[PDB]
Amino acid sequence: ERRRRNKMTAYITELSDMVPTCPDKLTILRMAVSHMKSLLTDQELKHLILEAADGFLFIVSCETGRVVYVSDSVTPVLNQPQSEWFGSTLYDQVHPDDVDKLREQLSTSRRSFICRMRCGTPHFVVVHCTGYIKAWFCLVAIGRLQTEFISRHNIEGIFTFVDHRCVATVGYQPQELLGKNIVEFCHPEDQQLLRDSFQQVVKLKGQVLSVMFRFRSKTREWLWMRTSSFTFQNPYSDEIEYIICTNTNV
């Protein structure tokens, strides 16, 4: 072929552009030889994992949980001295509720699991761990890193989800709103407005309409309140899953 030679040449050119001491074919063929004779690296693969997955390696005895080893990458990953970790126990570095899960993964193959570890200079970060069981037993593993309140209703207007902030916004416990119609909390004079909003967001399916109305707090006082809100539809069936609302104390 014609371009066969042309891409072999583009390779050669590419080579000369990357070999800084660097002529003809035999030569660059051999200058490359000497220039790599000067120079994947072992400890560098480590930096690759660190950069890519934000992972660090560690090896812990299976029987006890003893850290027979931790790579220093632990300090960029977890803000931990290598000393703080090495010679320690893996149960020491995980959330207490992850203790059990952890035990199962260390009984007497591949291993893969997720767990909260401690960082610091009491906070936990989630950690994906992979690796395998080698004899010595031990586990060779890598751990990498990864004003208003909101409500959902059925198309009738029944509260079917509120975040705890309703307590701070309107005085009610979530239980005292859940199961009831948002219109039941609406001032008379405004109820038709609220319902117009609810017929409309459903007809104008997808989009956000917003409406204002008074809302009786737990202490009975009428609270002006703006709710922008929109229907949410099922990605497959396009059935209306529910209406999503953000009820902002005006």
Partner: protein, 290 residues
């Protein structure tokens, strides 16, 4: 004659086994050499059978125009294609075309990258190996940084197919099966002890019933990703537990196709609970009142 000498020289002075370095044609010796130099070059800017074997994926670095200038050694264990075969070749020649655009966006221009990409796979479930025309598409979870000429340094993890599990499972994960409208057709039975639901209650309920509202949007995108590509890993999200409160889950999911019919039956979810119940004072939903 006199060039064949120096080609075998360069080959056996590539970082390769004498074995594999003998066999290379010259275009491959070019490719591999160049990728090795390029790669070393990026490395300066940044700064083993263990790390390699403890990984559940492979490392790869791809230039901004798509050249795959480095692929970790163990890639073959997951894709069947080898480091020697692919090094120096375009990522776009080995990925699903309907992913090419997304890949392009992720090679380009915050530095953190996370997406899913379908790549050619020529190793078979359990051991065996096929030929490049007989190539299946495999979905990979890719996370890394784009970095400065620009590179993308990613780790690519295959998502284990739930029918084929090489890997064991602990008490803190449970399985669930869904209609394509994300309904509950089947659920594991540890779901009770972990969250308190009995499987009966969940069936014919849309999973959207149990998302913390603050999650639902994220979840739909994951779903859409799952349907475009065939597998997915969710971000983390919290499921409304039964007696109030919630739990941190993270699910990987798989549409399973009817093998005779060739249509897709359902979605298999493998569900990783990451926490106990949190904030069980609080009742977020109607379910948590009864």
């Amino acid at each position: 004659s006199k060039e064949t000498e120096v080609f075998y020289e360069l080959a056996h002075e590539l970082p390769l086994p004498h074995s594999v370095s003998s066999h290379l044609d010259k275009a491959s010796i070019m490719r591999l050499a160049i990728s090795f130099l390029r790669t070393h070059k990026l490395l300066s800017s940044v700064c083993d059978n263990l790390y390699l074997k403890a990984l559940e994926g492979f490392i790869a670095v791809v230039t901004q125009d798509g050249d795959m200038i480095f692929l970790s050694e163990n890639i073959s264990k997951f894709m069947g294609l080898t480091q020697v075969e692919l090094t120096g070749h375009s990522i776009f020649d080995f990925t699903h075309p309907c992913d090419h655009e997304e890949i392009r966006e992720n090679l380009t221009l915050s530095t953190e990258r996370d997406f899913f990409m379908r790549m050619k796979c020529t190793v078979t479930n359990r051991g065996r190996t096929v030929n490049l025309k007989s190539a299946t598409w495999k979905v990979l979870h890719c996370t890394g940084q784009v970095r400065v000429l620009s590179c993308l340094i990613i780790m690519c993890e295959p998502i284990q197919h739930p029918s084929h599990m090489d890997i064991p499972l602990d008490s803190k994960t449970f399985l669930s099966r869904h209609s394509m409208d994300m309904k509950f057709t089947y659920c594991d039975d540890r779901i009770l002890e972990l969250i308190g639901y009995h499987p009966e209650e969940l069936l014919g309920r849309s999973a959207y019933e149990f998302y913390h509202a603050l999650d639902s949007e994220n979840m739909t995108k994951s779903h859409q990703n799952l349907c475009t590509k065939g597998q997915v890993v969710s971000g983390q999200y919290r499921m409304l537990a039964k007696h109030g409160g919630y739990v941190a889950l993270e699910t990987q999911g798989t549409v399973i196709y009817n093998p005779r019919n060739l249509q897709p039956q359902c979605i298999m979810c493998v569900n990783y609970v990451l926490s106990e119940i949190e904030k069980n004072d609080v009742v977020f939903s109607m379910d948590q009142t009864e």
